[PDB]
C-alpha cells in the first residue's frame, strides 16, 4: 500500500543559519560521522551526517530519501548542500535515535541472549524495513545490529534502519501473465539482506554468530571458506531447547546460493515471524 | 513576433495533495500519461493533472512543454511537481482546464458538412500560431493532430490550444548580416513533419475526410503507405469543386513528399489565405 | 524403426491458385491477422496467417513448423512465399480451430470457476504442448488463454497452442555430463511455467493471482506485487481447495525463475496425472 | 493498386534439359550477355541472361523478379541455378524483345527527331515502368534508350524496361504520418527522373542536353555543365517547341535531387496525360 | 562558359625583397592576414601583399585562391612566395591593387538614396559572375559580403572583384549522357550559402538596410538569429513601394531558409532581371 | 588561512524582471558576456548583471565564480538566475557594483610617472590575496590582468577585486604525504604567477616586460621573447629600483612554470609584506 510522498528539496543556505552544530559525535557512518546538532529556533536535538559531495554521496542521499518515507527507516528532516574549503558537501539532518543500537541491546544481554518471542519481535521489525526497501527496489547491503537504532529507551520504542552508504537500486507482454524476470531483471541482489537477517536471527537466539574466526580475528581464510561452503552448526548447549521451526528458518536464509534463499515476502509471512501478533 | 525574459521552470517538491485534491476522473489520455481532474484546495478551482513517471522522456516533455507554455496558443502549465509514488520519482504537470473539447470533436460534429474556406482559415491560423512559436524556439511538436488541439471553452470566442509534448523534440566565424540559416543552426528536418500535419488537417477541414487513408477501413495498410511515399492523393470533385486554386496550391505545398520542398511556418503564416482571417 | 519428420517446403505459387481468400477475420495474432480461406478443390475451410517477410516472420514460421509436429499445437497445412505490393510475404495456411479460445470458456464459467478435476485436465493439455516445445528447445513466451484454442465445440475437442510470434529457440563423458554443460540456456522456458501457474489460479477461482486493484491494465502496485510474489488464496473461493494444488501453484509462481518448477516435474505431478 | 503475385521458384535442373542454348548474342547487359535460346519442346525462341552467382547477381534477379510483375518491364519466364566449372550461376530465361531498342528508333529518325505527340507517348510508356518500380521501392538507376526495348516491330508494340544490373531497393498516427517518418530513403529514385528529362530532350531535337564539345564520352566541361545545370534549347530545333515541355524538362533536369519532379507528378502532368 | 589550359602555381622561394619594396602601409585586413602596400622594384608598380604564416589553412587559401584567380572577377594573384620570417615559414601572396574602394563604401556613400533596379542589377550581375566561376570549379566562397568585393579603380567603368579565400572550401571529394549530378559529384560542402549572401546584398542595394538585423543595433542577437532561421523579413512599404514584384520574387528565392529550395548560380545568372544589364 | 561553512548556490528560476529593473547602460564587457546596470525594484539599489547563454562553459564560470565569491577580494555574487530568452536557457549573474574604476585606468592615469615600490607592493598584495584564495580552493583564474581588477568605489578605503571567471579552471600517512601524492594538478595555477610578475613590472616603470617593437597587439618577435625569457630592466626607469624587487620579478617571470614562485611564497615575501 503506497501513497504520494514529497520529493527531496535540497536547501542551499548555510546550515548554521538554522542549526547549532556541536562537535559531539553521535555515531560513525559508512561515508561520514554523525554529529549532534540543535535547531536554533526550537532548541530540538537532531543528528547530522556530513558527506563530501560526490556520486556515492548523491546516491546515499537519494536512496535514503525514498526509504525515509517508511516508519522503520531513520527519518530525514532536511538535506543541505553547502560549501566548505571550496568543496561542495551534503549535510543530512535526521531525527535522533537515543534508544541505542540493536548491537548494544544484544551486548547488554550477553550469554543470556533472547527468547524465541523476543527474537521474533526484533526480526519482524527489521523485516518491515527490508520489506519496504525491497518493495521500492533498494537493497541496503549493510544490514547489521550496529545500523539498527532504537528511537528511545522506552518499551514501545521503534527499531529503525540507518546508513545507506552501501545501498543500491536493483532495477511487450500481457500484464496478468508476465513473469517477474520479464518485468524487472535485477541489477543487484536484495538476497544479501536476507542472508544478514539469518545472521542476526542466529545471534539473537544464542549470543554468538554462525560464522566467525576461531582465533577472534576480524576475518580469516577459514571464516571465508566456512561462509562460502555454508559450514555452520547449532551447538547443543545454547541451541538445545530452540525449535526446529526457527532452525529451519535460519537454514533457508543462510542458503549459500542466493536464488535458493528466502524472499522478504516469504520471511514476513512465516509463522514464527507473524507470532508477534 | 517579439521575445521577452521568461521565468525558468521551478519544480515544486512538496506533495501535490498539500495544494490540490486529486480526483480519479480521467479528463483525457496523453502519449506518456493520463490527464486527471484536480481541484485547488484553497481556491476550489478546477485543473488538469498529467502524471508521468520520472525518466529522460518525461523530463524532455516537461522541459519542452514549459518553454512552449509561454505562448497563448499552447496549454498553460500552472505548476510542475516532483513527488514519490511506489518508491519511484514522478513528474506531475498541473495545467489549465480546456473544457471546450478537441478540434477532432468539432470535426465529427460537422460530419459531411465540413468547414468553409473562411472557417478553415480561422482554425488553421490558430494552429499555425502555436507551430510558429515552437519552430521559432527550435521545437518540433511531431504529433500535430486534431486529437491534441483543444478549445479553452465552449464559447465562440474560445482559443484553440496545442497540447501533449510526448513526441516533441528540440531541433538544435561569420558576418551576422549575411550568415545563411544552415550556417547558424543546422537541423535534421523534424519541423517539416509539423508542416505535413497542417496540410493533412487543412485538407480534412475543407472536405471532411483525409488525403490518405486505407481503402478497406484498415488503420494502416501497404497501399496507404505507398500512397503517402508516392504523394498519391486527389481533390475529389463533389467536395473540392468549389474550393479555390489558392488553397489547393497551399495544400500541395504542405503535402510535398520531399521535406525540403515543403513550405516553412513563416511562409504559411504570411500566405494570403491564412492572413484573410487576420485582424490588422 | 527410424522416426523422421519432413522439413518445411515453402510453396512459391500464388496462394489464390489453390485457395479462395475471404476477408473474414478469424482472429488477430502477434504479427498478423488470421483470415478465413477455402480450398478451391475440396471447398474445405482453413485459417490463413499473413506475415510480411522479415527475420521475425521467418523465425515464427520456422519455430511453429518444428512445433506443428505435435498434436497439441495448431497444425500448419502449407506455407507460401508470395509478393504483394512489391514486398515478399509469408502466408501460413493452418487448420481451423472453431471451438473457441480457452479465454472464452473461462469467461463463460464466471464466478462458478472449474473443479479440481476439470482444471487439471485443462492444465494437462496445456502442459503437453509446453512439454513438446521445451523438449525441442523452444519457449513460447506468450502462453495465455487467448492463445489456446479448441478444435471444435464438441466435448472431445482438443485444446491447441497457437501464435509463435514471441517464440524463441533456447540453445565430457556422456553418462555423467550435467545439463548446464551440454546446453547452457538463456532461462526463457521458465516464463512459460509462470504462465501455467497464473492460468491454473484463474481456473480454480475465476480471478488472477496478480491484478491492478483499480481495474487498470498495469499499475506500479501490480508490478511490485509480481516482483515481490504478493498474492494470496482468498478463503471464500479457496476454502475447499486442496493444499496439493495450492503447493503446485506456489512452485510455479516462484519469483526466482531457477526456483520454478520444470515442465517435466509439472507433467509428473500427481494432481496433473489425476486426469488419468 | 496491387495484387497477390507468385514468389520466385529457382529451378535446379540443368537448363539444357528444357532449352537449346545457342551462341547467338542477342544483347549485352551490365552483368552478363543475353543469348538466344529455344524451348526444346515448343521450339519457341527466348533470351537467356547468364550471371555468375554472387550477392550482386542475386540482387538483380530478386529485384527484376518483383518488377517483372508489370507489363512495362521485360518478363522473366524462369530462373535456373546451375553449376559450370564448379561455380554456381544464375540463368535468367526472359521473353524475346525483337522490336529493337528505343536507341535504334532514335538513331533511325536522326535530325528529323520526334513530334511532341510521338515523344509524349514514348515518355508515358517509360514513365509507367518507372512508376511501378518507384511504387515498390526500386530505383532502376540505369534508365537510358539502350535499356528500353520494343516487344515487336509492329506499331502496337510495347516499350519495356530491361537490365536490373544497377537497380537498388530504396528502403529498410496513420493519417498524419509524413513520408520521411515512414520510409527514410536508403537510395535516390531521383536519378531515374533526371534520365527521363535527358531522354525527353533527345526525343524532341535529336541531341542530348549535356555532351562533350569534342565528341568525348565524358569531359571535365561536360561534368561541370551537368553539376551547374548548363544546357539550352537551341533555336533551330527548339523554336516551335512548346514552353510546356521546356518547363517539364527544366523540372526533371533540376540539379538538386530534392527539387526534381517525382514519378507521380510526371505521370499526372498534362503533357504526359495527353497521350490517352 | 568554356575553360582553357592555365598554368599551375609556382611558389617562388627567393626573398620577396629582391623583387618588391615592402611598405608598412596597411591597405586592408583579411580573414587570415593583413594586406600591405608593396611596389614592384623594377616597374615601380603598386601591388597588395597578404602575409600568411605557413600552415594547412594558409596552403588551402593560396591553393583555392590560385584556381579562382584565373577569372576576371576574382582579385588576381601576381605571385606567391614561401620565405622565412622570424624563423617561421610563411606564404606571401602578391595580388593586384583594387584602389576603387569596397562595395561597402559605395553602399554607405549612397545612404537612404540606395540604388536603382538598373544599378543594383549591374552590381549583382558582376558579383554573380565571380560566384558562377567559383561554383563551376567546385569552390564555395562562404564569406560573400560588401566588404570583400572591391572595385579595380575609382572610374565608372571599374570592375567589381571578389577577394579573401580565408573561409573558402572545395565542395567535392554510369552512362555519360544520362548521369545525374548527385551521381557524379555528391556535395562535401554547400555553395548555397553564397546564394543567400547575394539575396542579402541585393536587398541592401535596393533599400539601404539589411533584411535581417538586431533591433537594438547589436552585432548579433538571439532575435536576429531566429529571424534568419525562420525567414522573418519583410519589404517595408516606404522604400519597397515602387520596387517590382520580379526583383522581390528573386530575393524571396535566394533568401529561402532551406538550402535545397534556394536558387542556383546558373538560374540567378539567367534571370531576366540580372540579364537586363545587357538588354 | 581558515575556511568556514558557506552556503551553496541556489539558482533562482523566477524572471529577473520580477525583482530588478534591467537598464541598457553597459557597465563593462566580459569574456563571455556584457555587464549591464540594473536596479533592485524593492530597495532601488544599483547592481551589475552579467548575461550568459546557458552552456557547459557558462555553468563553469558561474560555479567557479560562486566558490571564489566567498572571499572579500573577488567580486561578490548577489544572485544567479536561470531564465528563458528566445526559447534558450540563460544564466543571469547579479553582482555588486564596482564603480571605483579598473586598476588599468589607474595605471594609465599615472603614465610615465609609474608607482613607487611601496604603493606597487600594496597593489600587488591585494591582487595576491585574491590569487591565494583561488589557489587554496584549486582554481586558476588564467586571465589575471589590470582590466579584470576593479575598485569597489572611488573612496580611499576602496578594495581591489578580481572579476571575470571566463577562463577560470578547476585544477584537480597524512603527516608525511607529499603534495603531488594528494592532488596531482589538472591545469596550472603558475600562469597566474606569471601575470603577477607582468603587472608588478608595469607598476614600477609604466611599460610591460614583453611587447611588440612596432606597437602590434602580438608579433612573432614578442612571442619568442616570452618563450625565451628576453626582457630587461632599462636603466632610465629601473636605475634606483631595488634588487629585491628585481629578483622577485625574475622569479615570477621564470619561463619554466615549475621554477616559478608559488602564491604562498609570494605572499610571504618581505617586499609584499612591507605594506604592513
Ligand atoms: O567473534 C566471536 C563472537 C562471540 C559473540 C559474538 C558476537 C558478534 C556480534 C554480535 Br552483534 C554479538 C555477538 O562474536 N567469536 C569468535 C571468537 C573466537 C575467539 C576469541 C574471540 N572471538 C566467538 C567467541 C566465543 C564464542 N563462545 C563463547 C561463549 N559460549 C558459546 C561460544 C563463540 C564465538
Ligand atoms: O477513414 C476514413 C475517413 C473518412 C473520414 C475520415 C476522417 C478521419 C479523421 C478525421 Br479528424 C476526420 C475524418 O476518415 N476513410 C477510409 C475508410 C474507408 C472505409 C471504412 C472506413 N474508413 C474514408 C471513407 C470515405 C471517404 N470518402 C471517399 C470520397 N468521398 C467522400 C467519402 C474517404 C475516406
Ligand atoms: O481484473 C480483475 C479481474 C477479475 C477477474 C479477472 C480475470 C482476468 C483474466 C481471466 Br482469463 C479471467 C478473469 O480479472 N480484477 C481487478 C479489477 C478491479 C476493478 C475493476 C476491474 N478489474 C479483479 C476484480 C475483483 C476481484 N475479486 C473477486 C472476488 N474476491 C475478491 C477479489 C479480483 C480481481
Ligand atoms: O554527342 C553528341 C551527340 C549528337 C547526337 C547525340 C545523341 C546522343 C544520344 C542519343 Br540516344 C542520340 C543522339 O549525341 N554531340 C557531341 C559531339 C560533339 C562533336 C562530335 C561528336 N559529338 C553533339 C553533336 C552535335 C550537336 N549539335 C546538333 C546541331 N546543333 C548544334 C549541336 C550536339 C551534340
Ligand atoms: O543595422 C542596421 C542597418 C541599417 C542599414 C544598415 C546597413 C548594413 C550594412 C550595409 Br553594407 C549597409 C547598411 O544596417 N539597422 C539596425 C539597427 C537598429 C537600431 C539601431 C541601429 N541599427 C537598421 C535597420 C533598419 C532601419 N530602418 C527601419 C526601416 N526603415 C528605415 C530605417 C534602421 C537601422
Ligand atoms: O605597447 C607598449 C607599451 C608601453 C606601455 C604599455 C602599457 C601596457 C599595459 C599597461 Br596596463 C600600461 C602600459 O604598453 N609599447 C610598445 C609600443 C610601441 C609603439 C606603439 C605602441 N606600443 C611600448 C612603448 C614604449 C616603450 N618604452 C621603451 C622603454 N622606454 C620608455 C618607452 C615600451 C613599450
Ligand atoms: C541522545 C542521542 C543518542 C544517539 C543518537 C543517534 C546516534 C546515531 C544516529 C542517530 C540518528 C541517525 C543516525 S544515521 C547513522 C547514525 C545515526 N549513526 C551511525 C551509523 C549507524 N550510521 C548512520 O548513518 N542518532 C541521537 N541522540
Ligand atoms: C471540464 C473539463 C473538460 C476537459 C478538460 C481537459 C481535458 C483534457 C486536457 C485538459 C487540459 C490539458 C490537457 S493536456 C492533455 C490533455 C488535456 N488531454 C489528453 C491529450 C490530448 N494530451 C494532453 O497532454 N483539459 C478539462 N476540464
Ligand atoms: C469457424 C471458425 C472459427 C474460428 C476459427 C479460428 C479462429 C482463430 C484461429 C484459428 C485457427 C488458427 C489460428 S492461429 C491464430 C489464431 C487462429 N487466432 C488468433 C491468435 C490466437 N493467433 C494465431 O496465431 N481458427 C476458425 N474457424
Ligand atoms: C529476334 C530477337 C532480337 C533481339 C532480342 C533481344 C535482344 C535483347 C534482349 C532481349 C530480351 C531480353 C533482354 S534483357 C537485356 C537484353 C535483352 N539486352 C541487353 C541489355 C539491354 N540488357 C538486358 O538485361 N531480346 C530478341 N529476339
Ligand atoms: C589605393 C588603394 C586602396 C585600396 C587598395 C586595396 C585594398 C585592399 C585590398 C587590395 C587588393 C587586394 C586585396 S585582398 C584583400 C584586401 C585587398 N583587403 C581586405 C580584405 C577584403 N581581404 C583581402 O584578402 N587593394 C589598394 N590601393
Ligand atoms: C556606476 C558603476 C560603474 C562601474 C560599475 C561596474 C563596472 C564593471 C563591472 C561591475 C561589476 C561587476 C563586473 S564583473 C565584470 C565587470 C564588472 N566588468 C568587465 C570585466 C572586467 N569583466 C567582468 O566580468 N561594475 C558599476 N557601476
Ligand atoms: Cl580461524
Ligand atoms: Cl488499401
Ligand atoms: Cl493497485
Ligand atoms: Cl568539352
Ligand atoms: Cl533583437
Ligand atoms: Cl616585433
Coordinates of N, CA and C in Angstrom, one line a residue, chain A residues 175-177, chain C residues 198 201-202 205-226 230-232 234 237-238:
Chain A
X175 N -0.2 -8.1 -19.1 CA 0.0 -7.9 -17.6 C -0.3 -9.1 -16.7
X176 N -1.4 -9.7 -16.8 CA -1.7 -10.8 -15.9 C -0.7 -12.0 -15.9
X177 N -0.1 -12.2 -17.1 CA 0.8 -13.4 -17.3 C 2.2 -13.1 -17.3
Chain C
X198 N -0.3 -19.0 -13.4 CA -1.4 -18.0 -13.5 C -2.7 -18.5 -14.1
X201 N -4.4 -20.7 -11.5 CA -5.0 -19.9 -10.5 C -6.4 -19.5 -11.0
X202 N -6.4 -18.8 -12.1 CA -7.6 -18.3 -12.8 C -8.7 -19.4 -12.9
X205 N -10.5 -20.3 -9.4 CA -11.3 -19.3 -8.7 C -12.0 -18.3 -9.5
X206 N -11.6 -18.1 -10.7 CA -12.2 -17.1 -11.6 C -11.5 -15.8 -11.8
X207 N -10.5 -15.5 -11.0 CA -9.7 -14.3 -11.0 C -8.2 -14.5 -11.0
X208 N -7.3 -13.6 -11.4 CA -5.9 -13.9 -11.4 C -5.2 -13.7 -10.1
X209 N -4.0 -14.2 -9.9 CA -3.3 -14.0 -8.6 C -2.7 -12.6 -8.5
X210 N -2.5 -11.9 -9.6 CA -2.0 -10.5 -9.6 C -2.8 -9.7 -10.6
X211 N -3.4 -8.6 -10.1 CA -4.2 -7.7 -10.9 C -4.1 -6.3 -10.3
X212 N -4.5 -5.3 -11.1 CA -4.5 -3.9 -10.5 C -5.7 -3.8 -9.7
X213 N -5.6 -3.2 -8.5 CA -6.8 -3.0 -7.6 C -7.9 -2.1 -8.2
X214 N -7.4 -1.2 -9.0 CA -8.4 -0.2 -9.6 C -8.7 -0.5 -11.1
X215 N -8.7 -1.8 -11.5 CA -9.0 -2.3 -12.8 C -8.1 -1.8 -14.0
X216 N -7.0 -1.2 -13.6 CA -6.1 -0.7 -14.7 C -5.5 -1.9 -15.4
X217 N -4.9 -1.7 -16.7 CA -4.3 -2.8 -17.4 C -3.0 -3.2 -16.7
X218 N -2.2 -2.2 -16.2 CA -1.0 -2.4 -15.4 C -0.8 -1.2 -14.5
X219 N -0.4 -1.5 -13.3 CA -0.2 -0.4 -12.3 C 1.2 -0.7 -11.5
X220 N 1.8 0.4 -11.0 CA 3.1 0.1 -10.2 C 2.9 -0.9 -9.0
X221 N 1.7 -0.9 -8.5 CA 1.4 -1.8 -7.4 C 1.3 -3.3 -7.9
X222 N 0.7 -3.5 -9.1 CA 0.6 -4.8 -9.7 C 2.0 -5.3 -10.0
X223 N 2.9 -4.4 -10.5 CA 4.3 -4.7 -10.9 C 5.1 -5.1 -9.7
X224 N 5.0 -4.4 -8.5 CA 5.7 -4.7 -7.4 C 5.2 -6.0 -6.7
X225 N 3.8 -6.2 -6.8 CA 3.3 -7.5 -6.2 C 3.8 -8.7 -7.0
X226 N 4.0 -8.6 -8.3 CA 4.6 -9.7 -9.1 C 6.0 -9.9 -8.7
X230 N 3.6 -11.2 -4.1 CA 2.5 -10.9 -3.3 C 1.2 -11.3 -3.8
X231 N 0.7 -12.4 -3.4 CA -0.6 -12.9 -3.8 C -1.1 -13.8 -2.7
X232 N -2.4 -14.1 -2.6 CA -2.9 -15.0 -1.6 C -4.0 -15.9 -2.2
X234 N -7.5 -16.3 -1.4 CA -8.6 -15.9 -0.5 C -9.6 -17.0 -0.1
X237 N -13.3 -18.4 -2.0 CA -13.2 -19.3 -3.1 C -12.2 -20.5 -2.9
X238 N -11.1 -20.2 -2.2 CA -10.0 -21.2 -2.0 C -10.2 -22.0 -0.7

